[PDB]
Homo-oligomer: A and B are copies of this chain.
């Protein structure tokens, strides 16, 4: 089981010696992030390891990262590593490959523009009101608040409503049909990465890592609203009634599902990360709350243009994403033999960009382990390399919902800080530790005290 296990030794590329069949997966016992920082420290700018028999080439040179993510995206590095068994979710944009992804990116792009986001803000604002009343409830109880529930309820509230046009107080309504389905769906893989040779077997088995009932539920659910108002689902329906063939009925369901996966636990974790940093830095929480009340006096409701007016809110969000890039890694499959910036890359290799390691690299960040929003001040922001700081990826296949995610979090933070201050309690994990999973998340959930202003 050492096929390809001599690839990096042949290329002269350093890296940890793999074991037969397993590759270097045993080193993942301390997590992706610790493994990336160690390899970066041990082997320098480039190194290779094996997910089972799959060679993975890590790169850290920003010139080389730009070549992979931007310049050679369409011709060489178009796709992420295969993920399955997907079934009909093969039509999702994040799973699609080559021309099929290229077409999906074109049809969905006008839906994620600045203009469309401003027309969705009044919807996001309503769920912000739900977040505040769900928070002040647990605030009544002096007993501390585990944020992942009230924030996860908010994160799922917005993302499924926008993606499917429904309305739910998901916390106070565990009964709505569009809730229980989305709940078991968002509960989420191993040997599919270590042993990806089984995926074709798993596919023909009719196996779907997505539950079979939820997918059949959402399909008939979207067909319900065909018989008919500014949401992801609605903006995609308008794209059908328009070059590329329009989004099919099944493709449309695939995109709405993939938006919930890319948006639920991602937003919920960053919101818990942000509030942990604001609780352990009262001055930053004070300076932020003072900015919100200046832009929005008398607890004025937030709007699209006022959110972009809050520079310190943008600095706090960006600095949290540097410390906690929940994707941890960016990956591209080398579709054909190429040489970039004076280095040969063999066809089939997975090229990985260790975002977590690069975000905490002392060579680019003074005291990289400290939460310091002034790194993103208008003075100091010009020194940050866009290919070192990559919380939303980069190039033509970056996070297409990036603008929305930032708006959605900022809108939640404004509505929460306008009403509450946040302090740590005796059970808050200080220092916070990271869980060893496929998304960067706090090891133990963030528990904080929530006082009412």
Contact A197–B206 (Cβ < 8 Å):
no
A88 (CB) vs chain B CBs: closest residue:
B3
Contact B1–A204 (Cβ < 8 Å):
yes
Give A3 Cβ to nearest chain B Cβ, in Å: 7
Task: Write the A308-345 contact mask toward B (1 if CB under 8 angstroms, else 0).
Answer: 00000000000000000000000000001100000000
Give CA–CA (A53, B53) in the complex, Å: 27
A2 (CB) vs chain B CBs: closest residue:
B206
Task: Write the A200-232 contact mask toward B (1 if CB under 8 angstroms, else 0).
Answer: 110110100000000000000000000000000
Which of the residues B100, B200, B337 comes within 8 Å of A99, measured between beta carbons?
A: B337
Q: Is A98 an interface residue (CB 8 A)?
A: yes
Give CA–CA (A197, B53) in the complex, Å: 18
Q: Is A198 an interface residue (CB 8 A)?
A: yes
| Interfacial chain B residues near A204, Cβ < 8 Å | 1, 3, 21, 53, 195, 197
Give CA–CA (A331, B182) in the complex, Å: 44
Give CA–CA (A197, B199) in the complex, Å: 9
A245 (CB) vs chain B CBs: closest residue:
B337
Contact A1–B197 (Cβ < 8 Å):
no
| Interfacial chain B residues near A200, Cβ < 8 Å | 196-198, 200
Give A427 Cβ to nearest chain B Cβ, in Å: 47
Which of the residues B3, B21, B98, B197 comes within 8 Å of A201, measured between beta carbons?
A: B197
Give A86 Cβ to nearest chain B Cβ, in Å: 12
Give CA–CA (A201, B203) in the complex, Å: 14
| Interfacial chain B residues near A53, Cβ < 8 Å | 204
Give CA–CA (A353, B162) in the complex, Å: 49
Give CA–CA (A273, B99) in the complex, Å: 47
Give A336 Cβ to nearest chain B Cβ, in Å: 6
Give A245 Cβ to nearest chain B Cβ, in Å: 9
| Interfacial chain B residues near A347, Cβ < 8 Å | 100
| Interfacial chain B residues near A198, Cβ < 8 Å | 200-201
A200 (CB) vs chain B CBs: closest residue:
B197
Which of the residues B99, B100, B196, B206 comes within 8 Å of A1, measured between beta carbons?
A: B206
Q: Which 6 A-B pairs have the closest CB atoms?
A: A197-B200, A197-B204, A197-B201, A99-B336, A200-B200, A53-B204
A-B contact pairs, 12 of them (CB 8 A): A1-B204, A1-B206, A3-B204, A3-B206, A21-B204, A99-B336, A99-B337, A100-B337, A196-B200, A197-B200, A197-B203, A198-B200
Q: A1-B206, A21-B204, A99-B337 are in contact. List 5 more A-B contacts (CB 8 A).
A: A3-B204, A99-B336, A196-B200, A197-B201, A197-B204
